[PDB]
Enzyme design. Structure first.
Site, PDB file in Angstrom:
ATOM      1  N   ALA D  20       0.825  -1.206   0.000  1.00  0.00           N
ATOM      2  CA  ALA D  20       0.000   0.000   0.000  1.00  0.00           C
ATOM      3  C   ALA D  20       0.859   1.254   0.000  1.00  0.00           C
ATOM      4  O   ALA D  20       0.687   2.135  -0.850  1.00  0.00           O
ATOM      5  CB  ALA D  20      -0.942   0.012   1.205  1.00  0.00           C
ATOM      6  N   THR D  39       9.533   4.887   6.630  1.00  0.00           N
ATOM      7  CA  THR D  39       9.320   3.473   6.908  1.00  0.00           C
ATOM      8  C   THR D  39      10.331   2.959   7.931  1.00  0.00           C
ATOM      9  O   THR D  39      11.518   3.283   7.865  1.00  0.00           O
ATOM     10  CB  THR D  39       9.381   2.638   5.600  1.00  0.00           C
ATOM     11  N   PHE D 121      -9.105 -20.285  -5.340  1.00  0.00           N
ATOM     12  CA  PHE D 121      -8.816 -19.831  -3.984  1.00  0.00           C
ATOM     13  C   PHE D 121     -10.102 -19.920  -3.175  1.00  0.00           C
ATOM     14  O   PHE D 121     -11.192 -20.068  -3.731  1.00  0.00           O
ATOM     15  CB  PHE D 121      -8.259 -18.399  -3.962  1.00  0.00           C
ATOM     16  N   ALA D 169       7.765   6.020  13.012  1.00  0.00           N
ATOM     17  CA  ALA D 169       6.773   7.059  13.276  1.00  0.00           C
ATOM     18  C   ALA D 169       6.199   6.887  14.676  1.00  0.00           C
ATOM     19  O   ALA D 169       5.835   5.776  15.072  1.00  0.00           O
ATOM     20  CB  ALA D 169       5.656   7.033  12.237  1.00  0.00           C
ATOM     21  N   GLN D 242      -8.554 -12.522  11.626  1.00  0.00           N
ATOM     22  CA  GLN D 242      -8.555 -13.681  10.753  1.00  0.00           C
ATOM     23  C   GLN D 242      -7.538 -14.720  11.210  1.00  0.00           C
ATOM     24  O   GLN D 242      -6.335 -14.441  11.264  1.00  0.00           O
ATOM     25  CB  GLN D 242      -8.243 -13.270   9.322  1.00  0.00           C
ATOM     26  N   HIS D 244      -5.825 -17.841   9.738  1.00  0.00           N
ATOM     27  CA  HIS D 244      -5.592 -18.591   8.509  1.00  0.00           C
ATOM     28  C   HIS D 244      -5.598 -20.090   8.825  1.00  0.00           C
ATOM     29  O   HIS D 244      -5.089 -20.510   9.869  1.00  0.00           O
ATOM     30  CB  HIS D 244      -4.263 -18.176   7.871  1.00  0.00           C
ATOM     31  N   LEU D 254       3.329 -19.433   7.249  1.00  0.00           N
ATOM     32  CA  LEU D 254       2.157 -19.694   6.423  1.00  0.00           C
ATOM     33  C   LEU D 254       2.427 -20.750   5.347  1.00  0.00           C
ATOM     34  O   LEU D 254       3.477 -20.755   4.702  1.00  0.00           O
ATOM     35  CB  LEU D 254       1.702 -18.397   5.750  1.00  0.00           C
ATOM     36  N   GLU D 257      -2.884 -21.080   1.033  1.00  0.00           N
ATOM     37  CA  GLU D 257      -4.159 -21.582   0.566  1.00  0.00           C
ATOM     38  C   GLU D 257      -4.101 -21.944  -0.922  1.00  0.00           C
ATOM     39  O   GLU D 257      -4.978 -22.662  -1.408  1.00  0.00           O
ATOM     40  CB  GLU D 257      -5.232 -20.514   0.871  1.00  0.00           C
ATOM     41  N   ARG D 288     -12.275 -18.744   5.110  1.00  0.00           N
ATOM     42  CA  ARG D 288     -11.266 -19.060   6.116  1.00  0.00           C
ATOM     43  C   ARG D 288     -11.869 -19.154   7.508  1.00  0.00           C
ATOM     44  O   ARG D 288     -11.469 -20.016   8.297  1.00  0.00           O
ATOM     45  CB  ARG D 288     -10.143 -18.036   6.057  1.00  0.00           C
ATOM     46  N   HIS D 355      -3.408 -14.311  11.495  1.00  0.00           N
ATOM     47  CA  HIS D 355      -2.868 -14.027  10.176  1.00  0.00           C
ATOM     48  C   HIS D 355      -3.094 -12.594   9.707  1.00  0.00           C
ATOM     49  O   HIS D 355      -2.210 -12.013   9.072  1.00  0.00           O
ATOM     50  CB  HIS D 355      -3.509 -14.975   9.163  1.00  0.00           C
ATOM     51  N   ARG D 399     -12.028 -11.659   5.586  1.00  0.00           N
ATOM     52  CA  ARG D 399     -11.404 -11.358   4.304  1.00  0.00           C
ATOM     53  C   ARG D 399     -11.268 -12.616   3.439  1.00  0.00           C
ATOM     54  O   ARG D 399     -10.943 -13.696   3.937  1.00  0.00           O
ATOM     55  CB  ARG D 399     -10.023 -10.726   4.532  1.00  0.00           C
TER      56      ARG D 399
HETATM   57  C1  LIG Z   1       1.419 -12.630   6.866  1.00  0.00           C
HETATM   58  C2  LIG Z   1       0.956 -12.914   5.461  1.00  0.00           C
HETATM   59  C3  LIG Z   1      -0.050 -12.154   4.880  1.00  0.00           C
HETATM   60  C4  LIG Z   1      -0.469 -12.425   3.573  1.00  0.00           C
HETATM   61  C5  LIG Z   1       0.150 -13.483   2.851  1.00  0.00           C
HETATM   62  C6  LIG Z   1       1.176 -14.230   3.478  1.00  0.00           C
HETATM   63  C7  LIG Z   1       1.571 -13.943   4.757  1.00  0.00           C
HETATM   64  C8  LIG Z   1       2.679 -14.740   5.415  1.00  0.00           C
HETATM   65  N1  LIG Z   1      -0.216 -13.809   1.591  1.00  0.00           N
HETATM   66  C9  LIG Z   1      -1.166 -13.089   1.025  1.00  0.00           C
HETATM   67  C10 LIG Z   1      -1.557 -13.405  -0.361  1.00  0.00           C
HETATM   68  O1  LIG Z   1      -1.069 -14.281  -1.050  1.00  0.00           O
HETATM   69  N2  LIG Z   1      -2.546 -12.615  -0.866  1.00  0.00           N
HETATM   70  C11 LIG Z   1      -3.149 -11.620  -0.180  1.00  0.00           C
HETATM   71  O2  LIG Z   1      -4.043 -11.019  -0.754  1.00  0.00           O
HETATM   72  N3  LIG Z   1      -2.830 -11.290   1.091  1.00  0.00           N
HETATM   73  C12 LIG Z   1      -1.870 -11.989   1.694  1.00  0.00           C
HETATM   74  N4  LIG Z   1      -1.476 -11.679   2.972  1.00  0.00           N
HETATM   75  C13 LIG Z   1      -2.121 -10.556   3.672  1.00  0.00           C
HETATM   76  C14 LIG Z   1      -1.374  -9.376   3.066  1.00  0.00           C
HETATM   77  O3  LIG Z   1      -0.115  -9.850   2.577  1.00  0.00           O
HETATM   78  C15 LIG Z   1      -1.101  -8.265   4.065  1.00  0.00           C
HETATM   79  O4  LIG Z   1      -2.344  -7.927   4.655  1.00  0.00           O
HETATM   80  C16 LIG Z   1      -0.516  -7.053   3.329  1.00  0.00           C
HETATM   81  O5  LIG Z   1       0.678  -7.445   2.649  1.00  0.00           O
HETATM   82  C17 LIG Z   1      -0.184  -5.856   4.233  1.00  0.00           C
HETATM   83  O6  LIG Z   1       0.347  -4.835   3.374  1.00  0.00           O
HETATM   84  P1  LIG Z   1       0.594  -3.332   3.858  1.00  0.00           P
HETATM   85  O7  LIG Z   1       1.164  -2.538   2.755  1.00  0.00           O
HETATM   86  O8  LIG Z   1      -0.816  -2.902   4.456  1.00  0.00           O
HETATM   87  O9  LIG Z   1       1.653  -3.362   5.095  1.00  0.00           O
HETATM   88  P2  LIG Z   1       2.960  -4.246   5.286  1.00  0.00           P
HETATM   89  O10 LIG Z   1       3.443  -4.931   3.922  1.00  0.00           O
HETATM   90  O11 LIG Z   1       2.719  -5.140   6.461  1.00  0.00           O
HETATM   91  O12 LIG Z   1       4.066  -3.126   5.646  1.00  0.00           O
HETATM   92  C18 LIG Z   1       3.715  -2.073   6.549  1.00  0.00           C
HETATM   93  C19 LIG Z   1       4.729  -0.958   6.397  1.00  0.00           C
HETATM   94  O13 LIG Z   1       4.506  -0.012   7.448  1.00  0.00           O
HETATM   95  C20 LIG Z   1       5.762   0.402   7.982  1.00  0.00           C
HETATM   96  N5  LIG Z   1       5.675   0.775   9.382  1.00  0.00           N
HETATM   97  C21 LIG Z   1       5.108   0.082  10.423  1.00  0.00           C
HETATM   98  N6  LIG Z   1       5.205   0.701  11.573  1.00  0.00           N
HETATM   99  C22 LIG Z   1       5.891   1.846  11.288  1.00  0.00           C
HETATM  100  C23 LIG Z   1       6.333   2.912  12.078  1.00  0.00           C
HETATM  101  N7  LIG Z   1       6.096   2.885  13.435  1.00  0.00           N
HETATM  102  N8  LIG Z   1       6.982   3.919  11.489  1.00  0.00           N
HETATM  103  C24 LIG Z   1       7.198   3.857  10.175  1.00  0.00           C
HETATM  104  N9  LIG Z   1       6.839   2.909   9.311  1.00  0.00           N
HETATM  105  C25 LIG Z   1       6.197   1.915   9.926  1.00  0.00           C
HETATM  106  C26 LIG Z   1       6.661  -0.848   7.853  1.00  0.00           C
HETATM  107  O14 LIG Z   1       8.011  -0.475   7.639  1.00  0.00           O
HETATM  108  C27 LIG Z   1       6.152  -1.492   6.559  1.00  0.00           C
HETATM  109  O15 LIG Z   1       6.928  -0.984   5.477  1.00  0.00           O
HETATM  110  O1  LIG Z   2      -3.990 -14.051   2.959  1.00  0.00           O
HETATM  111  C1  LIG Z   2      -4.232 -14.248   1.730  1.00  0.00           C
HETATM  112  O2  LIG Z   2      -5.001 -13.522   1.032  1.00  0.00           O
HETATM  113  C2  LIG Z   2      -3.600 -15.460   1.120  1.00  0.00           C
HETATM  114  C3  LIG Z   2      -2.787 -16.248   1.794  1.00  0.00           C
HETATM  115  O3  LIG Z   2      -2.463 -16.005   3.122  1.00  0.00           O
HETATM  116  C4  LIG Z   2      -2.195 -17.549   1.192  1.00  0.00           C
HETATM  117  O4  LIG Z   2      -1.268 -17.419   0.273  1.00  0.00           O
HETATM  118  O5  LIG Z   2      -2.684 -18.620   1.588  1.00  0.00           O
END
Ligand SMILES: *Cc1cc2c(cc1C)nc1c(=O)[nH]c(=O)nc-1n2C[C@H](O)[C@H](O)[C@H](O)COP(=O)(O)OP(=O)(O)OC[C@H]1O[C@@H](n2cnc3c(N)ncnc32)[C@H](O)[C@@H]1O
Ligand SMILES: O=C(O)/C=C(\O)C(=O)O
Ligand code: HEM
Ligand SMILES: CCCCCCCCO[C@@H]1O[C@H](CO)[C@@H](O)[C@H](O)[C@H]1O
Ligand SMILES: CCCCCCCCO[C@@H]1O[C@H](CO)[C@@H](O)[C@H](O)[C@H]1O
Ligand SMILES: CC1=C(C(=O)Nc2ccccc2)SCCO1
Ligand code: SF4
Ligand code: F3S
Ligand code: FES
Ligand SMILES: [K+]
Ligand code: NA
EC number: 1.3.5.1
Lengths: 240, 101, 139, 612
Positions: D20, D39, D121, D169, D242, D244, D254, D257, D288, D355, D399
């Site tokens: 994002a 970040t 899926f 932050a 959620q 998983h 993980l 799925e 899920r 998850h 989700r």
């Molecule tokens: C855990 C997980 C989730 C997941 C997945 C597999 C795993 C192991 N596989 C997925 C998949 O195949 N398809 C899907 O649709 N979703 C899947 N998920 C869920 C999804 O990956 C997550 O919900 C999503 O990736 C989260 O993305 P987001 O951009 O919202 O955030 P992030 O990648 O976790 O990174 C957060 C950023 O914020 C910065 N941050 C955090 N705290 C601070 C502070 N205090 N100050 C500054 N920056 C901060 C972090 O550095 C990070 O960059």
């Molecule tokens: O969270 C998701 O959307 C998908 C997964 O976690 C997955 O790869 O099983």
């Protein structure tokens, strides 16, 4: 019972800069610890010395954060099994020949900037139709990227390469060069000749002397040594 | 424009040549091989030590000095080999005489 | 905000004038046969070059022709075991560099890059070096 | 006073460099905005990099598809807590979003026509739930997140975004109920930085690390959610967590799925494919919340596997090894590393694992953060949120797999578009009081030198074990209430925190104590909201309140029914507040949005019985 394992770990504190780097020993009971070295590191910080400092995030060896030198070889702490021989002390160092920020944290900013310098993104001669339709790529052409796109940019390979030790200011190193190759052979990319022309100098590519520490050390099983040899072959035969 | 890759290619070519001259020296000793070895040995050696210099010597002035000295050594080296080939028994026969000891 | 060339320059300006230590490298890195053979290929190459340069130098400066010094040595009647040992020591660096050089030329053609092939070709180079050197020393 | 302050002026500041945050950050720069991205990690280390299964879009590469079917699947999946205007936006934009990523060079797997390969899926169907399994999950083998994040990071290198890497932050700079930036610590040198901007985007991820077992990164600590809470703004729906179905037993990593998408099955200790019993049609591709509860029941009822009968098995070895190596190579390696399992020969040990967080910062469908005053939603001027940190809410009470990576790029882009349609680059930066942020610095200075009797790791473990034991897959009122009392005590005992590192450069002792404060604010709202929600909906299951409680009884005909007043049903979003000095949690509610963005093009889906 308990199975006490010793870890000797490199320490240096920038806020006490005059204290020369040293090794500190920690005793960890393996029956109350996960199986990986990162597990032991987190246990030490949580229970024995919260000043111990290291990078980590994922846990399954996908993010690349926790790269360091364990038992003489560069690897990911989160996927490196602890050696259960209790007569042997496991020595942990930062990635080699790097500037230490603190303890096990190296300064990777040159590494990242070298990666930026090869333009690791898709470049077509006409990008104005971007966003409109899927580019077509055959299964066979896509298969050429296997073994290249999996790199997690942990820097284990580059910081194992003697040429990168002696010339890391100018030698791009195995991680960056293999990513350069990854964009050269992408059938969707139109800038192959320019990507090759970028390497026409004594250092960027040609400090590689086929030592092959990079391939031996890669925790993802990849082969940047071979990728570098393929660039050299392209370099020697591409026209204009 | 392609100077770096061209040099890399030339280095491999001279390496292969040196390889071919080893058997040639055993089968066809004499002037042709004698002077070809003089040239290929000097050029392969000059470029090889050049790689060593590029790896280990840093700093604008140290690098220029090191490479200037290498040129001197190479030139003296190729001169002696040709001098030995012309006014003496030559590389091929020198090796055979040495091995008759 | 900042270009890669600008980032690299900042990197070196920051760290060269910092208190940060350089983490150890040669003194802590685990050795392997390929890494040791790589160093030895460089070592033999330099030894051979300094050998050629010395010989070339001796030819220009020494007073006598080559057959004179060959005769002087033969007149000492040194042990054949000692002469055989001297022959082995002379041919060994050349034999190693030559075989390992072919190994490099094969790498440059893009072949033999699997870790298992890297290990196996190095061992083959070592056997071929010992066999050929032992055979050549006895001629 | 004691800390050097550095002030920056940008048009926009993005907190977060995941899927994002990166998409928002270079979307703003691509629109001409002078943009900062702050970040705490180097971008490609974010949790997005660990995502596996793929991203949803109705491209129709495998059979004929329709984005309105994906709309329907997401509405139903959310159990009618999802806002249908945002779901409309997300599913309709999905094809364009995935095409964008592939045109960036994301190395999608390919079909025999050369198009993007899509897999089945969990919980996705054709023909509005009537026509069987959809195949719309676009993937890069089982490393889709890795390739998504590395592709977006490389793309970001083409724009003039200013990146502030390894900056943590601490809080929002609020003035007059408007956000005017963020204050942060530079981990590399110890300095305090204030980023002033007309617009701030929160993209900080989830807070799965509030639990003892989770697939989430060590860095998923809810930092952005806690900044909003400290500003006095509501969070939304935090009790919807959620689980998983298939985290690997022991490690918690993980297992995608996608394994079940490609034909894998779950079996119990008797060899039974037990999802045939819990979901006759969908089987192991049920939603899920359903699969996780089903697996949990199998274990509670004595049919778990392993020496401790505490997990179940995921079987892949009936599949051709060439399909395993081509479609699931990542988990093939992971299964071997972390369980010693060869997936061509033996099953993987798995169990449901925390998850993903459905709740977060409440936003409208444009990405703007909202509050709710006198029964009406109101935009917070200058504040946006997207990704797992936001509650748009596209995911409601559950989700769908592969909708989160979609969510990230769709609403990262939407935040950028909304700001570009609302403001112009170079407008005057809002002003802040000279001491703006001083309380954040003072809190940072209290933890730095804290010398009490409860060290950070001890209170964090207490919090994680409490959440694991009192707010798990099945919940009940008395166990929730004891958990509430436990967390409230742990929160009060933060006054006795103890740290050891007195440095400022790379003091991860300090940073993890800041993260503990953030996690605790998320946990308190999660468990207090769960205790108040006396119904079962999606992932929130009460064994004392088993029925979903809507404004009508949608299992009977509506004619002649008396609508339940808003205070007498539960189809509404939870809004939670915390008084940060006391820990007192306050709960309010706001209606779900049932209207779409265009009734004629995409009809609203009324609540119905939810079965798989
Ligand atoms: C855990 C997980 C989730 C997941 C997945 C597999 C795993 C192991 N596989 C997925 C998949 O195949 N398809 C899907 O649709 N979703 C899947 N998920 C869920 C999804 O990956 C997550 O919900 C999503 O990736 C989260 O993305 P987001 O951009 O919202 O955030 P992030 O990648 O976790 O990174 C957060 C950023 O914020 C910065 N941050 C955090 N705290 C601070 C502070 N205090 N100050 C500054 N920056 C901060 C972090 O550095 C990070 O960059
Ligand atoms: O969270 C998701 O959307 C998908 C997964 O976690 C997955 O790869 O099983
Ligand atoms: C007589 C010879 C001399 C004096 C000599 C000298 C050298 C020197 C000085 C180097 C550079 C060392 C280094 O860069 O590590 C070198 C490298 C090399 N030599 Fe020779 N050499 C001789 C014979 C041969 C033969 C017969 C072959 C075949 C050969 C193949 C090579 C190759 C392939 C390299 C490149 C190694 C690399 O790329 O790292 N050499 N030699
Ligand atoms: C003996 C002369 C060999 C021909 C010159 O060779 C040159 O020598 C230079 C100086 O080291 C190198 O820098 C060049 O790369 C090389 O082409
Ligand atoms: C003299 C130096 C000899 C090299 C030391 C050998 O070391 C061993 O070599 C093997 C083959 O490379 C490796 O697989 C082992 O990991 C390594 O311990
Ligand atoms: C730089 C280089 C070598 C090198 O420096 N290796 C090395 C030196 C010291 C310690 C370990 C390896 S040997 C082969 C050619 O290239
Ligand atoms: S090639 Fe291997 S060792 Fe090098 S950065 Fe990539 S994953 Fe790490
Ligand atoms: S170790 Fe270094 S010299 Fe080349 S083969 Fe690997 S990049
Ligand atoms: S912590 Fe992510 S690679 Fe080890
Ligand atoms: K969320
Ligand atoms: Na190409």
């Amino acid at each position: 019972t308990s199975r006490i394992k010793k870890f000797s770990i490199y320490r240096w504190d920038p806020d006490k800069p005059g204290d020369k780097p040293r090794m500190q020993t920690y005793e960890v009971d393996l029956n109350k610890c996960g199986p990986m070295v990162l597990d032991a590191l987190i246990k030490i910080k949580n229970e024995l010395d919260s000043t111990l400092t290291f990078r980590r995030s994922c846990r399954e060896g996908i993010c690349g954060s926790c790269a360091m030198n364990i038992a003489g070889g560069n690897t990911l702490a989160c996927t490196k099994k602890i050696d259960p021989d209790l007569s042997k002390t496991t020595k942990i160092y930062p990635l080699p020949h790097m500037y230490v920020v603190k303890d096990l944290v190296p300064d990777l900013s040159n590494f990242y900037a070298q990666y930026k310098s090869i333009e690791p993104y898709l470049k077509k001669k006409d990008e104005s139709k971007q966003g409109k339709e899927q580019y077509l790529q055959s299964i066979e052409d896509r298969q050429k990227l296997d073994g290249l796109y999996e790199c997690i940019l942990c820097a284990c390979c580059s910081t194992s390469c003697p040429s990168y030790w002696w010339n890391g200011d100018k030698y791009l190193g195995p991680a960056v060069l293999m990513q350069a190759y990854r964009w050269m052979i992408d059938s969707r990319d139109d800038y192959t000749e320019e990507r090759l022309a970028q390497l026409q100098d004594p250092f960027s590519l040609y400090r590689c002397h086929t030592i092959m520490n990079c391939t031996r050390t890669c925790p993802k099983g990849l082969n940047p040594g071979k990728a570098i040899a393929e660039i050299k072959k392209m370099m020697a035969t591409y026209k204009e | 424009s392609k100077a770096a890759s061209l040099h890399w290619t030339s280095e491999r070519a001279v390496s292969a040549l040196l390889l071919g001259l080893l058997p040639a020296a055993y089968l066809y000793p004499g002037p042709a091989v004698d002077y070809s070895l003089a040239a290929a040995l000097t050029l392969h050696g000059h470029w090889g030590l050049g790689q060593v210099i590029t790896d280990y010597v840093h700093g604008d002035t140290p690098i220029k000095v090191a490479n200037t000295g290498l040129y001197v050594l190479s030139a003296i080296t190729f001169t002696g080999l040709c001098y030995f080939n012309y006014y003496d028994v030559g590389i091929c026969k020198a090796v055979a005489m040495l091995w008759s000891i | 905000a900042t270009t890669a060339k600008e980032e690299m320059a900042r990197f070196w300006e920051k760290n060269t004038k910092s208190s940060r230590p350089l983490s150890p490298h040669i003194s802590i890195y685990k050795w392997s046969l390929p890494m040791a053979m790589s160093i030895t290929h460089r070592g033999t190459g330099v030894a051979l070059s300094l050998g050629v340069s010395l010989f070339s130098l001796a030819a220009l400066l020494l007073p006598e022709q080559f057959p004179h010094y060959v005769a002087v040595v033969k007149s000492l009647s040194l042990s054949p075991a000692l002469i055989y040992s001297a022959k082995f020591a002379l041919v060994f660096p050349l034999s190693y560099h030559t075989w390992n050089g072919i190994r490099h030329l094969v790498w440059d053609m893009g072949k033999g890059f699997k870790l298992s092939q890297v290990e196996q070709s190095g061992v083959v180079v070592l056997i071929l070096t010992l066999l050929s050197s032992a055979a050549i020393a006895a001629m | 006073t004691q800390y050097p302050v550095v002030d920056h002026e940008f048009d926009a500041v993005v907190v977060g460099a995941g899927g994002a945050g990166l998409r928002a950050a270079f979307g703003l720069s691509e629109a001409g905005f002078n943009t900062a991205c702050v970040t705490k990690l180097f971008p490609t280390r974010s949790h997005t990099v660990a995502a596996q299964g793929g991203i949803n879009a109705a491209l129709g590469n495998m059979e004929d598809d329709n984005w309105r079917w994906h709309f329907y699947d997401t509405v139903k999946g959310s159990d009618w807590l999802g806002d249908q205007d945002a779901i409309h936006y997300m599913t309709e934009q999905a094809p364009a979003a995935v095409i964008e990523l592939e045109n960036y060079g994301m190395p999608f797997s390919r079909t025999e026509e050369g198009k993007i390969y899509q897999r089945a899926f969990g919980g996705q169907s054709l023909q509005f739930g009537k026509g069987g399994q959809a195949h719309r999950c676009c993937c890069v083998a089982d490393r889709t997140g890795h390739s998504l994040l590395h592709t977006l990071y490389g793309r970001s290198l083409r724009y003039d975004t200013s990146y502030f890497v390894e900056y943590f932050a601490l809080d929002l700079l609020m003035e007059n109920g408007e956000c005017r930036g963020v204050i942060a610590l530079c981990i590399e040198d110890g300095t305090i930085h204030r980023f002033r901007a007309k617009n701030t985007v929160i993209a900080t991820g989830g807070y799965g690390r509030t639990y003892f077992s989770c697939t989430s990164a060590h860095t998923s600590t809810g930092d952005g959610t806690a900044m909003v809470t400290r500003a006095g703004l509501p969070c939304q729906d935090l009790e919807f967590v959620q689980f998983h179905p298939t985290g690997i037993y022991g490690a918690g990593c993980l297992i995608t799925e996608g394994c079940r998408g490609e034909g894998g099955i779950l079996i119990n200790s008797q060899g039974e494919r037990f999802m045939e019993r819990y979901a006759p049609v969908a089987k192991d591709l049920a939603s899920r919340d359903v699969v996780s509860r089903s697996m949990t029941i199998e274990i509670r009822e004595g049919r778990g596997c392993g020496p401790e009968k505490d997990h179940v098995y995921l079987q892949l070895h009936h599949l051709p090894p060439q399909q395993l190596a081509t479609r699931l190579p990542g988990i093939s390696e992971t299964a071997m590393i972390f369980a010693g399992v060869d997936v061509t020969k033996e099953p993987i040990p798995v169990l449901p694992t925390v998850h993903y967080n459905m709740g977060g910062i409440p936003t409208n469908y444009k990405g703007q953060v909202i509050t709710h005053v006198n029964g009406e939603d109101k935009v917070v001027p200058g504040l946006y949120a997207c990704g797992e940190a936001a509650s748009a809410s596209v995911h409601g009470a559950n989700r769908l797999g592969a909708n989160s990576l979609l969510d990230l790029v769709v609403f990262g882009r939407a935040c950028a578009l909304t700001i570009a349609e609302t403001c112009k680059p170079g407008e005057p930066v809002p002003s802040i009081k000279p001491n703006a942020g001083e309380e954040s610095v003072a809190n940072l200075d209290k933890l730095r030198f804290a010398d009490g009797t409860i060290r950070t790791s001890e209170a964090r473990l207490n919090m994680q074990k409490t959440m694991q034991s009192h707010a798990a897959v099945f919940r009940t009122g008395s166990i929730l209430q004891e958990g509430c009392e436990k967390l409230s005590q742990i929160y009060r005992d933060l006054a006795h925190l103890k740290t050891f590192d007195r440095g400022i450069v790379w003091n991860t002792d300090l940073v993890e104590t800041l993260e503990l404060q953030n996690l605790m604010l998320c946990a308190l709202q999660t468990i207090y909201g769960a205790e108040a929600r006396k119904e079962s909906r999606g992932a929130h299951a009460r064994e004392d309140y088993k029925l979903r409680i809507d404004e009508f009884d949608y299992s009977k005909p509506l004619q002649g029914q008396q609508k339940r007043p808003f205070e007498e049903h539960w189809r509404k979003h939870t809004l939670s507040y915390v008084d940060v000095k006391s820990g007192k949690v306050t709960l309010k509610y706001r209606p779900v949005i049932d209207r779409t963005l265009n009734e004629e093009d995409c009809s609203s889906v009324p609540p119905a019985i939810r079965s798989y």
